[PDB]
Design a protein around this ligand. Sequence first.
Ligand SMILES: O=C(O)[C@@H]1O[C@@H](O[C@H]2[C@H](O)[C@@H](NS(=O)(=O)O)[C@@H](O[C@H]3[C@H](O)[C@@H](OS(=O)(=O)O)[C@H](O[C@H]4[C@H](O)[C@@H](NS(=O)(=O)O)[C@@H](O[C@H]5[C@H](O)[C@@H](OS(=O)(=O)O)[C@H](O)O[C@H]5C(=O)O)O[C@@H]4COS(=O)(=O)O)O[C@H]3C(=O)O)O[C@@H]2COS(=O)(=O)O)[C@H](OS(=O)(=O)O)[C@@H](O)[C@@H]1O
Ligand code: NIO
Length: 329
Amino acid sequence: SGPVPSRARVYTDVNTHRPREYWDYESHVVEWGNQDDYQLVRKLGRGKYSEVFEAINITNNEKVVVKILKPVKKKKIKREIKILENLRGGPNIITLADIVKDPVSRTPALVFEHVNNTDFKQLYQTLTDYDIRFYMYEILKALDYCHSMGIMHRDVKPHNVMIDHEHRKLRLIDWGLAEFYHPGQEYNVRVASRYFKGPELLVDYQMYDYSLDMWSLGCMLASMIFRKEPFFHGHDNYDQLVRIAKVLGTEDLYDYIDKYNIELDPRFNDILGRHSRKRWERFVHSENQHLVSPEALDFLDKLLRYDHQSRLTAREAMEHPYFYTVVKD
Ligand SMILES: O=C(O)[C@@H]1O[C@@H](O[C@H]2[C@H](O)[C@@H](NS(=O)(=O)O)[C@@H](O[C@H]3[C@H](O)[C@@H](OS(=O)(=O)O)[C@H](O[C@H]4[C@H](O)[C@@H](NS(=O)(=O)O)[C@@H](O[C@H]5[C@H](O)[C@@H](OS(=O)(=O)O)[C@H](O)O[C@H]5C(=O)O)O[C@@H]4COS(=O)(=O)O)O[C@H]3C(=O)O)O[C@@H]2COS(=O)(=O)O)[C@H](OS(=O)(=O)O)[C@@H](O)[C@@H]1O
Ligand SMILES: O=C(O)c1cccnc1
C-alpha cells in the first residue's frame, strides 16, 4: 500500500547514537553575544527569510557578515543555529562567529566569519577544467563533512557557494534549509531551487536523504562542464521532471517510480512523453569540449541517477578518477 521506505546507505544512524541535545534543536538554548560589538556597513541582500549585511566587529576591526533572520517560522531559526554550531570548524563550512539579538528587528542575527561577497554563480561558467575539478573537490569536502555529521544541506546551488578565487578558498553557506537525517523520517519535498531539485522531490517521495545533495551537485557539475545554465531548464516543477527525462529517459524514471511504489501525479501523463537516455556526448560542443573528459562524464553519470540510492556518496565521489589530477592538500 503506497510508497515503500528508503534509508541512506551511509551515515544512516549517526543521529540515533547522539545525545538528544545534538539533534533536538527545538530544545536548544541560544547563547547570546553582545550586539554592540557589530556595526552594520551596507546591505548585501535579502532572502525570503533574512537580510544580509556587511558589518564590522568593532572589538577587533575585522569584517563579518550579519544575517538578520526575518520573523520566519520560529522553529527554523533554532534549526539553522544548531546545525551551524554542530558543523562549526568543519572543512569548507561557513563559520558562525556569534549570535546577537538585533535591536531593530528584535530577532536573532547570525554573525559569520567574513567571506568575499563573491558567490560561485559569478565564476562557475568561466573556470578552467582544472579549477572545476579543484572547486568540486572543495565542495565535496563540505558535503561529506555535513553528511557524516547527520545533516543534509538541501539547497546546494551556485549562490550558496562563496568563493575567494584569489586565495582558492570556498565556503558552503546558507544552512537555513538544512535538516537532520533521521532514518525513516518523511521530509518536506519543497526544498532546493527548481533547477537543482532531485527527482525524489519532483515525484513527491518524502523519505529522502543526503543523496539529494549529490543530485544537486551533479546539476552544478553538468552546468559547468557543458557551459549550459541551467542544465535541466524546467519552466515549473513539473516541466523540470520532463527536462530530466529528456536526458535520462523515461524507462529508468518509470523503473524508479516502480521500485519505490510511487504514485506519479497524473498531470505527468500528458507531458512526460517517451524518451530514451541520451549519451553524454550529445551535450559536448566546440565551446565546452576542453572541460569534458572521459573521467568527467563517468563521474557525472554516477551523480545524475534517478534512484537516490544508486548515486555516488560524497566520499565515493572524492575517490573518483576525475580528481586524480587535483593536487591533494
Ligand atoms: O539575479 C540573480 O542573482 C538571480 O539568480 C537566480 O535566482 C536566485 C535568487 O536570486 C535567490 N533569491 S534570494 O533572495 O537571494 O534568496 C534564490 O531564490 C530563492 C528564493 O527563495 C526565491 O527567489 S526570489 O527571487 O527572492 O523570489 C524563490 O523561492 C521560490 C521557491 O524556490 C519555491 N519553492 S518550491 O519548492 O519550488 O515550491 C516556491 O516557494 C513557494 C512554496 O509554496 C513555499 O516555499 S517553500 O519554502 O518551498 O515551502 C512557500 O509557500 O512560499 C512559496 C513562494 O514564496 O512562492 O516559490 C518561491 C518563489 O519563487 S518565484 O515565484 O519568484 O519563482 O527561489 C528560490 C530559489 O532557491 O530558487 O536562489 C535563486 C537560485 O540561485 S541559483 O540557483 O544559485 O542561481 C536566478 O538565476 S537562474 O536560476 O535563472 O539561473 C534568477 O532569479 C536571477 O538571475
Ligand atoms: O549562511 C548564510 O546565509 C551566509 C553566510 C555568509 C555570507 N552570506 C550568507
